[PDB]
Amino acid sequence: TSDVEERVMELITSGDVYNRLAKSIAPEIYGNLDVKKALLLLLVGGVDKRVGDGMK
Amino acid sequence: VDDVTGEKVREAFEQFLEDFSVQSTDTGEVEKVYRAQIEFMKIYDLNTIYIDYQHLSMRENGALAMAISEQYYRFLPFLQKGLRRVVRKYAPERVFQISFFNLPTVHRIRDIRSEKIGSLLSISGTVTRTSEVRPELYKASFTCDMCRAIVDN
């Protein structure tokens, strides 16, 4: 929300997570929309747990 | 004033060589062990001595043995002069050395900062990558050939 939010709201208004973002990244390939979804969640990763105790 | 102190430790060590540190009589431990140290030496001709830290600590009760622990970087060419005097009076080419052994404590190599300049400190460890056997000099007969080269520094 650091004054570029007018272009960040466009994802929140239009939505379209599952396919428009899939067609966004690497649109130069033949087919394979399923496998370009398997990478983008690794681009945001996903933290397992702030474990606190000795369980790394 | 260390000259006479060096002369004090000259004779006090020499007087220690006049006595023994023998505690038992004819149950083993024959008396006057330092006189026999001269006696074995005048047969096999090895040019050594062997003195321990115990029996020199337990004569002056540490009033003298504690002094040489911090000074015998300088006192080492002093005690050699006294034993060189007592040998002619007790025995018939003569170079020697001073061989202390068996101090109480044992240190590691990581403990040498400031007190270890001129001290005596038994050190353990292992040994690797030796070298050869070369000669050293310690005394010259060299002099200039201007008039006569017989100056012996």
Partner: protein
């Protein structure tokens, strides 16, 4: 008050301004860290300096910012940081004497009043690495965060000199106190002692310690392209060989700069080299009490200690009671029941496990690495047959021989945790039988022979095929 050509510092008001601040404190700083302390830490600790006789007072030195006055002293510490510690070493001797004048039975007023105590202003200010150290920072406190790499042993330093010429007895001892040694050009000690051979007996005057350590900063949010650079260290006090190489570190250093000679044999010099001088450093038989022995005897009164140690070893692991038996049993690794003649048996045993892949096979081994402070950890070809022990390696400091021990000898007081015992090469997996049997490693290297032992204890974590 006095005035120096260099500084603008005062006379001993700030010492007295500290001494009333030191003694009449009892609490401060309650407002900057507002949460809601009856007596100051230092007040008990200043009594604690004499009764142990130590020389070091680790001053937090963020107390002058909490105090109303002594800001001028506080903002002269960070601007002339050599005279201010040179002032306060005199005061702490007198402020200790300020306690001995009350109780005259405190160490006879002579012998502890000879060894000079000192102080250590640490954790002051904040700093952020190396890409901010401007040339204006000439004499300031710096707070580095980084990592030391490698050390050299102590070399000596000219703190006192000695002289003797060729007369009978003349044993003067000049001082240096600079980078300059001063000599006489004509003799002394007698009337007819003209200008002659004044000689330098070097191995007689005493020296202190000194040590240089190399540091390289940790990559702490570096912008992923910049190479982490380096800077050196230097120390003077009794901190030599108390900071081993290879740990996270913080230093409380001042700043200096030295000249260098370009040619090795002239007095010519001009791009300088800086280095820091540390005042205090910080990283980040146990003292056996009797309450712990009383606490475990309550647990030793409980018969289910086997079951109590069965449940304690697994904070997350599934139950599996059979594997938990020998693991604590191997950790309870017997003793050396050794006879005088014959035998030399030791009660150490060796468990192993293999089977289903990734059933916390490694994390259990990581968990065993937690419970023992002095142990090993195997690697994937971090060690090898010749890479374990028996080294020849041409090190970058002296290019000579070094015999570093392998991990099996390195576990003298631990448990050898080792893995990959189906992918290990058959050049190795041939010397562990000897440490299984004669408890030793026989070294056949070009350097030397040695039948050194290895007080060891092993477990094996294999894998299916």
């Amino acid at each position: 008050l006095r005035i120096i050509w260099g500084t603008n510092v005062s006379i001993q008001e700030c010492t007295t301004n500290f001494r009333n601040f030191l003694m009449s404190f009892k609490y401060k700083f309650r407002k900057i860290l507002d949460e809601r302390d009856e007596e100051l830490y230092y007040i008990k600790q200043l009594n604690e300096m004499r009764e142990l006789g130590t020389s070091n007072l680790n001053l937090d030195a963020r107390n002058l910012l909490a105090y109303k006055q002594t800001e001028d002293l506080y903002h002269q510490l960070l601007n002339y940081p050599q005279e201010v510690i040179s002032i306060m070493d005199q005061t702490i001797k007198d402020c200790m004497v300020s306690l001995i004048v009350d109780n005259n039975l405190d160490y006879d007023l002579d012998e502890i009043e000879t060894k000079f105590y000192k102080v250590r202003p640490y954790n002051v200010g904040s700093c952020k690495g190396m890409r901010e150290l401007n040339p204006n920072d000439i004499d300031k406190l710096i707070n580095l965060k980084g990592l030391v790499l490698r050390s050299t042993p102590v070399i000596p330093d000219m703190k006192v000199a000695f002289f003797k010429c060729n007369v009978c007895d003349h044993t003067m001892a000049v001082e240096i106190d600079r980078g300059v040694i001063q000599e006489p050009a004509r003799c002394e000690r007698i009337d007819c002692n003209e200008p002659n051979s004044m000689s330098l007996i070097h191995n007689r005057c005493s020296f202190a310690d000194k040590q240089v350590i190399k540091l390289q900063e940790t990559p702490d949010f570096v912008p992923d392209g910049q190479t982490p650079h380096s800077i050196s260290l230097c120390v003077y006090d009794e901190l030599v060989d108390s900071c081993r190489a290879g740990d996270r570190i913080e230093v409380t250093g001042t700043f200096r700069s030295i000249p260098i000679r370009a040619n090795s044999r002239q007095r010519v010099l001009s791009l300088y080299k800086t280095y820091v001088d540390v005042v205090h450093v910080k990283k980040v038989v146990r003292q056996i009490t009797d309450q712990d022995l009383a606490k475990i005897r309550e647990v030793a009164a409980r018969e289910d200690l086997y079951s109590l140690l069965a449940r304690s070893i697994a904070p997350s692991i599934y139950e599996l009671e059979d594997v938990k038996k020998g693991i604590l049993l191997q950790l309870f690794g017997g003793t050396n029941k050794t006879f005088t003649k014959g035998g030399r048996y030791r009660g150490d045993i060796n468990i192993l496990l293999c089977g289903d892949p990734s059933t916390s096979k490694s994390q259990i081994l990581q968990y065993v690495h937690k419970i023992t402070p002095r142990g090993v950890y195997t690697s994937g070809k971090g060690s090898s047959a010749v890479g374990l022990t028996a080294y020849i390696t041409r090190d970058v400091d002296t290019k000579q021989l070094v015999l570093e021990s392998g991990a099996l000898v390195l576990s003298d007081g631990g448990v050898c945790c080792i893995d990959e015992f189906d992918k290990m090469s058959d050049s190795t997996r041939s010397v562990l039988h000897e440490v299984m049997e004669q408890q030793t490693i026989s070294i056949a290297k070009a350097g030397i022979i040695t039948t050194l032992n290895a007080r060891s204890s092993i477990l094996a974590s294999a894998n299916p095929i």
